[PDB]
Amino acid sequence: KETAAAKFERQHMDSSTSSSNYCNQMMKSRNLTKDRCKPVNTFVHESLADVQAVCSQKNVACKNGQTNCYQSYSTMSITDCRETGSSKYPNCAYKTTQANKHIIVACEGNPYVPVHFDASV
Numbered sequence: 001k002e003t004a005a006a007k008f009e010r011q012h013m014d015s016s017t018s019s020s021n022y023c024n025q026m027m028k029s030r031n032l033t034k035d036r037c038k039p040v041n042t043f044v045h046e047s048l049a050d051v052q053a054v055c056s057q058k059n060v061a062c063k064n065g066q067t068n069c070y071q072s073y074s075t076m077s078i079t080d081c082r083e084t085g086s087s088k089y090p091n092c093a094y095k096t097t098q099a100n101k102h103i104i105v106a107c108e109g110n111p112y113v114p115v116h117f118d119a120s121v
């Protein structure tokens with residue numbers, strides 16, 4: 001069905017813009033609360049082209065020890081969503097935290113595009 005690149009865009013891209021309720025709404029609408037409350041998830045508020053370009057930027061080790069992760073040279077506008085301590089599926093609750101940080105994504109395929117959000121720094 002959904003490609004890895006498409007799933008990345010679904011789980012991590014929001015070029016369209018946050019408020020205190022952003023994560024509650026967004027995690028729901030992007031289907032990250034379907035089977036489980038996804039504990040941690042980041043949305044990137046840059047253009048797709050800008051985020052895709054990260055796959056030709058600074059090559060860094062992935063957290064899992066693979067070598068196909070890439071760090072943005074520039075900081076990017078992001079929102080971190082983190083499940084609260086009182087969150088209970090299926091009413092998943094998140095704290096919304098905006099920041100401007102370098103992103104690290106894993107890239108794969110031809111074309112070579114982001115498939116996983118690894119970290120922000």
Ligand SMILES: O=c1ccn([C@H]2O[C@@H](COP(=O)(O)O)[C@H](O)[C@@H]2O)c(=O)[nH]1
Nearest residue numbers: 011039040041042115116117118119120
């Ligand atoms: O800063 C972070 C750290 C992890 N993640 C999430 O991204 C997950 C990696 O899975 P994927 O990007 O393939 O959905 C990771 O395990 C965590 O759930 C973020 O979005 N941002």
